[PDB]
Design a protein around this ligand. Structure first.
Ligand code: HEM
Ligand code: HEM
Ligand code: HEM
Ligand SMILES: OC[C@H]1O[C@@](CO)(O[C@H]2O[C@H](CO)[C@@H](O)[C@H](O)[C@H]2O)[C@@H](O)[C@@H]1O
Ligand SMILES: OC[C@H]1O[C@@](CO)(O[C@H]2O[C@H](CO)[C@@H](O)[C@H](O)[C@H]2O)[C@@H](O)[C@@H]1O
Ligand SMILES: OC[C@H]1O[C@@](CO)(O[C@H]2O[C@H](CO)[C@@H](O)[C@H](O)[C@H]2O)[C@@H](O)[C@@H]1O
Ligand SMILES: [Cu+2]
Ligand SMILES: [Cu+2]
Ligand SMILES: [Cu+2]
Ligand SMILES: [Cu+2]
Ligand SMILES: [Cu+2]
Ligand SMILES: [Cu+2]
Lengths: 438, 438, 438
């Protein structure tokens, strides 16, 4: 086996196809860095990265290659870093073997046993923090026979980011672990920032070309409903596996997962890669462009065209004139009818459509001496819950009704509804009577 | 090519199978509307829609058809509207070409190049708002050879809705973008409202029939774990693609995605379509019915039967009697043992099971002169974090320990635990000593 | 048909392969229990379960078997319980037919028509609560020809849990429905607790063995990005269906869904099953171990090895020294430039890059007499929204601009930017002028 140096490429670029009918020893040299970068216009963030970029450098090897993996951590790094590649068969995917303090180096070796497109990421405590700061990338293990040649290959990885400040707030934004743990992202992006791959930084192709996208999802947390606006995937390698799906509009990419999608571009214009959990795209930044140049094909698409729609919208909260006014019951008939709504929405699942309950389990509200003898017991049952021995129409019950957080109006109305149905005692209970039971 | 008028159907109905062995020019006329509708009993919402319904009218064409797409916006609309169909190969899926102010019309043309079941939706700023208000539907592009005939075809699309008020609050509810951006839905529904397709509005079939469901997910945000209670999918077209999976209980439908599922119904009764992220179904409204009529088959299923379970439950918070009481350490042995728990749960990932750390990266807590000489430094390290040059047992460290938001009791206990292990100095630190370090 | 007793196994164990070339009548006896168990060290929780464990007992049958299902509810249970098995063709998956009050029993019969690995769970109101308390398990319906023999079979089910207290808080923790409805989990676990299947409770195998995992996701709410650290799935049965995917790093398991994954273990060490929405694994508890014993294979993996990484981290919030300082504009040129950022991030999607808008829909900001004549109208448009008839450069508009929740500084800056572009009137608006418009 001859040794070769891996050619690593920054996103959105991909190394050339392997030019070997046989195995080699591949030497990889990757460094870990911590540095400030732009996350959106006017907003900065300390990105942690494999090789200077988020996602990290793309690695391309052949199934069966013997890999020497060298990780070096810059001395300016404050944290140790390591690597788990999903392409590795071995403990921690390399994590135990690549633990690298600032200024130091580690080396491990592995054979690439499985072809596919694999996420790699840092595996240093706090793991979610390292990953959330941008420490992820892709390694392609080509099948022995190689992949079909295509005209354009691009590398993108989606990530969710969590900042102390809100989206768009100017300044150097720190990581917010409270948001990250809650899975509540401020930014969702391809390739490390809002607008990383739009306008002059767009992916490019020409009419008639085949395009392949190597799409990863570094997470840490979110699952991508991955879609290209104005295109349909001719082929999807399902979850990056061997299975090929065709004619797919939108595919799910797991957190810590990847997929390969392919399509021929037949019409010129801008095609927009998004996470179709759609506020992530137009509000949080999960929007990249593929700009296709060449002659119109009016047999495929013809219409007015102007790049004045599908622009980024930001994350400010937009509101229309509010239409809501509180409604309260004014008389007994109205309490009964409002109460029926409360009953059917909240009580019926147990006590049933005609108040009959389920014998031995949920007692009847229909002709209930328990309720009729003191309607405030029905009020208390809702507010406080009801458990333990009770008697309803001389039948013993011993179940548990949960407390339910209904307001005074709803309780007053539902109890009034029940009292005026199913041969119960009639009368009514008011919201103020309920308030005083609290 | 002869021209034909597309027959558009409201949910849950589907147009008839294409009756052509060849291509046609298909003319579609679709209008956009804004109008109040019911979202749950007593609750109203301003739905924005393609053709009057949420989801919009179903469109059925054949692969290779030349489509003339006409969109008209009613003059009562306050907003412009447009359309992106996932079936279109072309910029914006038609969005740039169909931008239609109230009272106006737009026309574009496209060829349906890819067979499948495709989401369409509005693409007008604010995009998430337009989609969240109900502007989505499905277009079926039949394969040239057509689909197998089945006895029943139904159209459903799941959507997540975001209201200023809580679930079930009577009144005209406005859209809440703050909730939408956070992906925190008040309602999750099929076909535009809670109970849209239950009881008298159920889907129907007869024992022995084959049923096909065209199921979309308009989002905007949520991914559906789509399941039919009491049934198993005989076939799933994976993510709406060419790939067929069989014997699937539950399938993921991406936001802005779709799938076709098929099953033969062999037993009578009510079968319940749900999103199996299960609070969405029984609490938030993602519950539709397929009622199957015909003779029992006791060789397949026999049991007591009564439609008194799996009823809608509403979204009120139910609580059982609370069992929780705060626990604090009463003596040194107890502080040590409680501290061991805090240590193993929060500190060990770096400082290791026996306090040895990782040389050069995480300093030892075992026989730590740094801690033993002033235990309050350990307290401060947790409260404030610790970074920069330190010395531990004459070894230099320069790492960064994050601040960790542990309370006074937990800090006091973990520091006491460490002091009483690994040949450290003993003694203890109290919660009040920790409080005063803050 | 001979009758046989189902052998039910507790997690992570699986019953032996069916030893029959033909159908049988299989009798299942399962009980429902409510009891306190550990959820994490020092933390207890009342688990509700089928047979004593979370997940419940594993059931293994053959396609075509006639099943008699007996459910018995212990008299110490406070709640009724029932069962919906996804393997059943019939109403409620058995739910209507198995409703069992404490001290009681129910029986129903069904034929297992579809092979696969199926979730079962409780279906008693409140359904989400019963499921969230641990009431789920798996039933395997073997295909008639059986599954390939493997060396190790293990049973795991992921669940999300919701407690009143925060992760790790000592005591008996009650279920928190408010968190559950919001899908905001405190714990995410395999097999019912943090550390259920780590250390001495790890899964085990030997180098060279084939391992099959029957992996379910009981939810109630979350979807698992299921991954085994240091391994690649040789085969995945997609969503538990007939379709086989190969060489998959991470697969999505739907809530109320399952999958079978297989891999040969070729290197010794600890391999870590996780949900790769990665904070769930290292912080919330979704971390199980498979420990593989045997000789090293240095041709596959060679590196330093020490089980000092990928340790559980707990859910305390960790923070690095905060780098953020608020920035405000000091002069007109700076207001203009800061305003350009606000403009491009929040306004451009409608009013366009050069302020031209879209004729008839979004009015121009370029040379806008409306704004130039009273810049405070631009301020008000943002704060309050703007709707109804207006006139811009003698052109009538009647659209609706949403209110947008921008702060005083951002509004002052964006209006100043607009005034100083596109032949507008110049001048400026200050943050204090904006404040007073509120
Ligand atoms: C706001 C909606 C509800 C109303 C108005 C309501 C009403 C009542 C009333 C008046 C009683 C006293 C006994 C009787 O008259 O039969 C009762 C008890 C009971 N309810 Fe409800 N209920 C509601 C919700 C629910 C729900 C959703 C469940 C099922 C999770 C439930 C289960 C029970 C049980 C088990 C008891 C007996 C408790 C014992 O034996 O101590 N209830 N309810
Ligand atoms: C509440 C749990 C923790 C306790 C009780 C604890 C304790 C301490 C103590 C007493 C020191 C001072 C030096 C020494 O005595 O060795 C220290 C420093 C340090 N710890 Fe922790 N620690 C905890 C959590 C963590 C975690 C989770 C990490 C890894 C993310 C970490 C990483 C470090 C580092 C890097 C230093 C050295 C800082 C410098 O060089 O300025 N610690 N810790
Ligand atoms: C903070 C960002 C924004 C600024 C500075 C801004 C500015 C203005 C101004 C000054 C006007 C008054 C008319 C004119 O001068 O042309 C106006 C009106 C209008 N804007 Fe905006 N705008 C912003 C955001 C948006 C967005 C995002 C939309 C689209 C969802 C929008 C849609 C409209 C419409 C429809 C009107 C006319 C309202 C009517 O006819 O009553 N604006 N805007
Ligand atoms: O002794 C730990 C110390 O050595 C370094 C290299 O200088 O890392 C070595 O030890 C790690 C943990 O065992 C290995 O994963 C790694 O391969 C090896 O180089 C420093 O990074 C570390 O602080
Ligand atoms: O001039 C914009 C104005 O014209 C209308 C039709 O009255 O829309 C036209 O312009 C749109 C944007 O370029 C096209 O997408 C559309 O096809 C075309 O009819 C109005 O809708 C719009 O306000
Ligand atoms: O009468 C309801 C009462 O009977 C029990 C058995 O004691 O359950 C029976 O009724 C259920 C509801 O119809 C059936 O699903 C079940 O098969 C049947 O045994 C009790 O559980 C219930 O409280
Ligand atoms: Cu790192
Ligand atoms: Cu990983
Ligand atoms: Cu619209
Ligand atoms: Cu779309
Ligand atoms: Cu139960
Ligand atoms: Cu289920």
């Amino acid at each position: 086996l001859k040794t070769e140096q891996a050619i690593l490429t920054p996103p959105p670029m991909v190394p050339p196809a392997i030019n070997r009918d046989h195995s080699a020893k591949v030497v990889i040299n990757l460094e870990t860095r911590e540095q400030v970068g732009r996350i959106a216009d006017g907003v900065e963030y300390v990105f942690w990265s494999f090789g200077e970029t988020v996602p990290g450098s793309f690695i391309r090897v052949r199934e069966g290659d013997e890999i020497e993996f060298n990780l070096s951590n810059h001395p300016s790094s404050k944290m140790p870093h390591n690597i788990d590649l999903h392409a590795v068969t071995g403990p921690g995917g390399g994590a135990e073997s690549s633990f690298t303090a600032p200024g130091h180096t580690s080396t491990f070796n592995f054979k690439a046993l499985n072809p596919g497109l694999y996420i790699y990421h840092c595996a240093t405590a706090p793991v979610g923090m390292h990953i959330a700061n941008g420490m992820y990338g892709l390694i392609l293990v080509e099948p022995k026979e190689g992949l079909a040649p295509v005209d354009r290959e691009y590398y993108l990885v989606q990530g969710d980011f969590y900042t102390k400040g809100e989206f768009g707030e100017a300044g150097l934004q720190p990581f917010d672990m409270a948001k990250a743990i809650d899975e509540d992202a401020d930014y969702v992006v391809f390739n490390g920032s809002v607008g990383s791959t739009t306008d002059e930084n767009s992916l490019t192709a020409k009419v008639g070309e085949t395009v392949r996208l190597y799409i990863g999802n570094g997470g840490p947390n979110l699952v991508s409903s991955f879609h290209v606006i104005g295109e349909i995937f001719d082929t999807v390698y399902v979850e990056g596996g061997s299975l090929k799906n065709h004619n797919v509009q939108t595919t799910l990419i797991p957190a810590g997962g990847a997929a390969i999608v392919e399509f021929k571009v037949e019409v010129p214009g801008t095609f927009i890669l998004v996470d179709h959990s759609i506020f992530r795209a137009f509000n949080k930044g999960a929007l990249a462009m593929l700009k296709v140049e060449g002659p119109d094909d009016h047999s495929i698409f013809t219409g007015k065209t102007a790049e004045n729609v599908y622009l980024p919208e930001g994350s400010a909260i937009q509101s229309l004139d509010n239409t809501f006014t509180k409604i309260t019951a004014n008389n007994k008939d109205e309490q009964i009818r409002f109460g029926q709504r409360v009953y059917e929405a909240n009580c019926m699942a147990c006590h049933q459509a005609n108040g009959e309950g389920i014998p031995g389990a949920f007692p009847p509200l229909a002709k209930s001496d328990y309720l009729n003898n003191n309607p405030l017991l029905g009020v208390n049952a809702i507010i406080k819950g009801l458990s333990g021995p009770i008697k309803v129409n001389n039948v013993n019950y011993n179940g548990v009704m949960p407390a339910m957080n209904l307001n005074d109006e709803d309780i007053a109305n539902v109890i009034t509804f029940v009292l005026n149905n199913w041969d119960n005692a009639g009368g009514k209970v008011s919201a103020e009577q309920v308030a005083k039971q609290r």
